[PDB]
Amino acid sequence: MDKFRVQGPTKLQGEVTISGAKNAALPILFAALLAEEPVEIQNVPKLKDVDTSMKLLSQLGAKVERXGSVHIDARDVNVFCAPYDLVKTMRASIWALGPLVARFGQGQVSLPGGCTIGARPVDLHISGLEQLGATIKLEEGYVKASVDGRLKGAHIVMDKVSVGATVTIMCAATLAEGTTIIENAAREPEIVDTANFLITLGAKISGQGTDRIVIEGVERLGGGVYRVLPDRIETGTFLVAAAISRGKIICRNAQPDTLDAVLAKLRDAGADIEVGEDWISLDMHGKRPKAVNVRTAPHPAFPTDMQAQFTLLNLVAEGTGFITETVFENRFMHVPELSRMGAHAEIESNTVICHGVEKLSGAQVMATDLRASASLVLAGCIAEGTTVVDRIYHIDRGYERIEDKLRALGANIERVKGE
């Protein structure tokens, strides 16, 4: 099992080109199960979850290939049970269910996996599909859905905001008979990107990006060419990397408007930020960041996917700052690991109270999920001495070539294999 050995401290500065969003590429790949003409998806990041999704789609009978772009021809899909091994390793696999039921009248998918940061039920996906007319039963761990004929449009008032369930309902509604209105819909940029991809195929959707999405079902979806938007979490991760190391960075192929909350908190931390049509620059002017208070919540509020990274920022910042996590109930595993590197923090229920220190010390650490693992690698870059982050395959799920990108910013990092 691979690890990253990092030698610190190193000031991270330079430039990085942001890859396509992990969390837009994934729902779009599964939405392609609805397409009855070939599709070309551009700017797809080379990530472990994308590899898993391509294999999963192939096992359903879709013809899939890639490089920068992924090409999919789902016209001959003929298997409606997703394979357990591919389903259980990530969260995105749940998105195979809705398209299979909407287009073929049936689908079976085991409960998903992915980030171990909460119980992560899928009750809202099930409830939404049931409201669209699907009959669903859970048996031996598989969610089995079916419908005789087409799904039927419905006015669905989500009783909890959910990125994934909004996607499931929106995608399935594109082939339903009639109009579907999703209330309390998640507004994330990836939902807007998935909607625009579906519209490219011929779907009729409006309201994406707002709390109310209206879908008018059509008989079938066609094909198209679509470019995935930039990864806002990767962008935020590199901006934090520059901030905590008192450096400067320019992120290219970025989309500033997907990061209003994050950029505002970085400015509160003392960063000098400028933005262009497709880039973001951050300069600390050699200064240590100032601690900030943060509360995660659904988009456009501060994203839970940037929470571990900002915990790190506060732990090396000037002063005390808190990080309140309201979206997931078990997303503080990075804290005890950063404490072993010399950080000072206390956890009070859903909030981490951070007291910034001047410098961290290298240590052997390990994170059990994607963003926590990336945060430990960033800590290693600025810590004094050697840090070894174990189980880094978690990072591969959401970052394309983080090693090369950090190295280009000045990091001393090596991927060590086999012990």
Ligand X SMILES: *[C@H](C)[C@H](O)P(=O)(O)O
Ligand Y SMILES: CC(=O)N[C@H]1[C@@H](OP(=O)(O)OP(=O)(O)OC[C@H]2O[C@@H](n3ccc(=O)[nH]c3=O)[C@H](O)[C@@H]2O)O[C@H](CO)[C@@H](O)[C@@H]1O
In the bound state, the residue with its beta carbon closest to ligand X is: 114
CB neighbourhood size of 79 (10 A): 14
Q: For residue 113, what are the CA distances in angstroms to 78, 88, 369?
A: 24, 5, 11
Residues 297-326 that bind ligand Y (CB under 6 A): 303-305
Pick 160 or 340: Cβ nearer ligand Y: 160
Using the rule CB under 6 A, which residue among 10, 19, 23, 235 binds ligand Y? 23
Residue 405 near residue 51 (C-beta atoms within 8 A) = no
Of ligand Y, ligand X, none, which one sits near residue 122, judging by CB under 5 to 8 A according to partner kind?
Answer: ligand Y
The active-site residue out of 81, 115, 171, 251 is 115
> Tokens 């999405």 — which residue?
213
Q: How far apart are CA 316 and CA 267, in angstroms?
A: 16
Of ligand X, ligand Y, none, which one sits near residue 162, judging by CB under 5 to 8 A according to partner kind?
Answer: ligand Y
Pick 12 or 25: Cβ nearer ligand Y: 25
Tell me the window of 123-131, 170-178, 211-219, 259-267 that interacts with ligand Y (CB under 6 A).
123-131
Using the rule CB under 6 A, which residue among 19, 93, 162, 373 binds ligand Y? 162
> According to the annotation, is 167 in a ligand binding site?
no
Residue 118 binds ligand Y (CB under 6 A): yes
CA 237 to chain centre: 12
> According to the annotation, is 397 in a ligand binding site?
no
Tell me if the bond preceding 300 is cis, omega within 30° of 0.
yes
Closest by CA to 338, choosing from 389, 287, 405, is 389
Alpha helices (H) in 106-188, listed in sequence order: 123-131, 163-173
Q: How far apart are CA 184 and CA 159, in angstroms?
A: 7
How many residues sit close enough to ligand Y to count as binding (CB under 6 A)? Answer: 21
Contact footprint for ligand X (CB under 6 A): 90-92, 114-115, 117, 369-370, 398
Q: How far apart are CA 341 and CA 365, in angstroms?
A: 9
Tell me the window of 61-69, 121-129, 201-209, 240-248 that interacts with ligand Y (CB under 6 A).
121-129
> According to the annotation, is 22 in a ligand binding site?
yes
Using the rule CB under 6 A, which residue among 55, 75, 160, 415 binds ligand Y? 160
> According to the annotation, is 77 in a ligand binding site?
no
For residue 4, the surrounding DSSP H or E stretch is strand 3-8
- 251 as an active site residue: the answer is no
Closest by CA to 288, choosing from 270, 268, 267, 307, is 270
Closest by CA to 299, choosing from 370, 203, 233, 242, is 233
Pick 369 or 396: Cβ nearer ligand X: 369
Residue 266 binds ligand Y (CB under 6 A): no
Residue 138 binds ligand Y (CB under 6 A): no
Give the number of C-alpha atoms closer than 13 A to the C-alpha of residue 336, restricted to the C-beta side. Answer: 7
Residue 78 main-chain phi, psi, to 5 deg: -145, 10
Pick 231 or 403: Cβ nearer ligand X: 231
Q: How far apart are CA 196 and CA 191, in angstroms?
A: 9
Using the rule CB under 6 A, which residue among 65, 85, 123, 346 binds ligand Y? 123
Pick 26 or 214: Cβ nearer ligand X: 26
Q: What are the beta bridge partners of residue 145?
A: 107, 136
Using the rule CB under 6 A, which residue among 4, 226, 238, 328 binds ligand Y? 328
> According to the annotation, is 267 in a ligand binding site?
no
3-state DSSP assignment of residue 379: helix
Contacts to ligand Y by CB under 6 A:
23, 26, 91-92, 118, 120-125, 160, 162-165, 303-305, 327-328
Q: Which residues line the annotated binding site for UDP-N-acetyl-alpha-D-glucosamine?
A: 91, 120-124, 160-163, 305, 327
Active-site residues, by number, are: 115
Q: Which residues line the annotated binding site?
A: 22-23, 91, 120-124, 160-163, 305, 327
